[PDB]
């Protein structure tokens, strides 16, 4: 099975930007082959075909070029829609099979987050469980160092980070740091804490509540 | 032009048999091109699996061969994929697609689960803002997804309308179960004001919850 070489693995281009996405054959494929976008968590779309085809409603900032083992996609006077994955497949000979992917960002200048904090709901306490959970949004690079905190005792137990890929709106990342514990433990505390550390701060980021409260 | 519309059970057991259904409507599958099967595994990789061309004609990837099978149907005008003997390995979100002047068009895809693990169905809960922190310009609410399987849920925030400043984070995974939440941020003349609800499905279960976010006590 012939493997498609695709390069580079993710890029940062600014706006306006213009990339070229080499994919380079095994073999000699004789321009059997197609470019696909997948834009977040939906469907692709083939944006060439037989190596150097526009596809039908492809706007013409997209084009691509090749012969025999080596192809490349280049879009020009790129948008924040531009900024998603990119995968070529070659269907000469069989089976087919796709190259490896090329994610693309915007390049963006750094961001502290906007921190939120969130006790448990009155309906999850009731249901036996509590989570308190915390939002850190829109910033940049996505490297973030969070931080939990109950009555001061720092807290590695009962959390979970999620992060999301980069908003094309607004170039920035968000992550999502949950703590789950029991309600009689959470009925048990008083402070609650949540320190997000960026390479943009000197000193974290603190939200915190009291229970009491 | 044509749709491509691939409907199927979403949750397998292992050993058991992966069976799919991809709907052509807009064009005759005996007409032309040929029909597909590809998956995509988390971290996007993508598999191609096989196809069916407009004159029945098979052909598989060989990594699949003893276990592929891709027939049709041309009075309804539909393809199926049929997968044998899956193993937790064969997850992976399920696409048909046209071939031949490249891959033209696409069908919205299909998260294919392959466990022994129980459907549960998600219990939703409203995240406030902080207790008496009363804000100004801006006001962050929240929305969290507990308990629930296998992959697949929608969180919309009432409908669609609060869709710009909406941030909902991929879900993880702990224990056979899937916890995820978003985050909404609006103005404030807009809340309390307007009924802002967290609007979730859940097709395994049909468990289409709305929650109010309303403040505490």
């Known amino acids: 099975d012939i493997l498609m070489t695709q390069s580079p693995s993710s890029m940062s281009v600014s706006l306006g930007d213009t990339v070229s996405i080499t994919c380079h054959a095994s073999?000699?494929?004789?321009?059997?082959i197609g470019w696909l976008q997948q834009k977040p968590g939906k469907s692709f779309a083939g944006l060439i075909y037989?190596?150097?085809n526009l596809s039908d409603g492809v706007p013409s900032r997209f084009s691509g070029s090749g012969s025999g083992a080596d192809y490349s996609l280049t879009i020009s006077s790129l948008e924040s829609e531009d900024f998603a994955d990119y995968y070529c497949?070659?269907?000469?000979?069989?089976?087919?099979?796709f190259g490896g992917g090329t994610k693309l960002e915007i390049a963006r200048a750094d961001a502290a987050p906007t921190v939120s904090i969130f006790p448990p709901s009155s309906e999850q306490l009731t249901s036996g469980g509590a989570s308190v959970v915390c939002f850190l949004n829109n910033f940049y690079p996505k490297d973030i160092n969070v931080k939990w905190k109950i009555d001061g005792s720092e807290r590695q137990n009962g959390v979970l980070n999620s992060w999301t890929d980069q908003d094309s709106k607004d170039s920035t990342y968000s992550m999502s740091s949950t703590l789950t514990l029991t309600k009689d433990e959470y009925e048990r505390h008083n402070s609650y804490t949540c320190e997000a550390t960026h390479k943009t701060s000197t000193s974290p980021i603190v939200k915190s509540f009291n229970r009491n409260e | 032009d044509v749709q491509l519309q691939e409907s199927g059970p979403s949750l397998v057991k292992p050993s058991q048999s992966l069976s799919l259904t991809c709907t052509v409507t807009?064009?005759?599958?005996?007409?032309?091109?040929?029909w597909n099967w590809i998956r995509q595994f988390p971290g996007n990789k993508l598999e191609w699996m096989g196809y069916?061309?407009?004159?029945?004609?098979?052909r598989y990837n060989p990594s699949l061969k003893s276990r592929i099978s891709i027939t049709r149907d041309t009075s309804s005008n539909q393809f199926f994929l049929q997968l044998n003997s899956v193993t937790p390995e064969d997850t992976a979100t399920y696409y048909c697609?046209?071939?031949?002047?490249?891959?033209?068009?696409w069908g919205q895809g299909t998260l294919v689960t392959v466990s022994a693990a129980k459907t549960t169905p998600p219990s939703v809960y409203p995240l406030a803002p902080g207790c008496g922190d009363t804000t100004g310009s801006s006001v962050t609410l929240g929305c969290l997804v507990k308990g629930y399987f296998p992959e697949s849920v929608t969180v919309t925030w009432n409908s669609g309308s609060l869709s710009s400043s909406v941030h909902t984070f991929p879900a993880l995974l702990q224990s056979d179960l899937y916890t995820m939440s978003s985050s909404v941020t609006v103005p404030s003349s807009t809340w309390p004001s307007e009924t802002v609800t967290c609007s979730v499905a859940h097709p395994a279960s049909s468990t289409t919850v709305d929650k109010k976010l309303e403040p505490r006590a």
């Open positions: 697609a046209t071939a031949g002047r490249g891959f033209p068009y």
């Open positions: 807009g064009y005759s599958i005996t007409s032309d091109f040929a």
């Open positions: 069916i061309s407009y004159s029945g004609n098979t």
């Open positions: 073999q000699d494929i004789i321009s059997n």
């Open positions: 037989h190596g150097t």
């Open positions: 497949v070659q269907y000469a000979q069989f089976p087919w099979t």
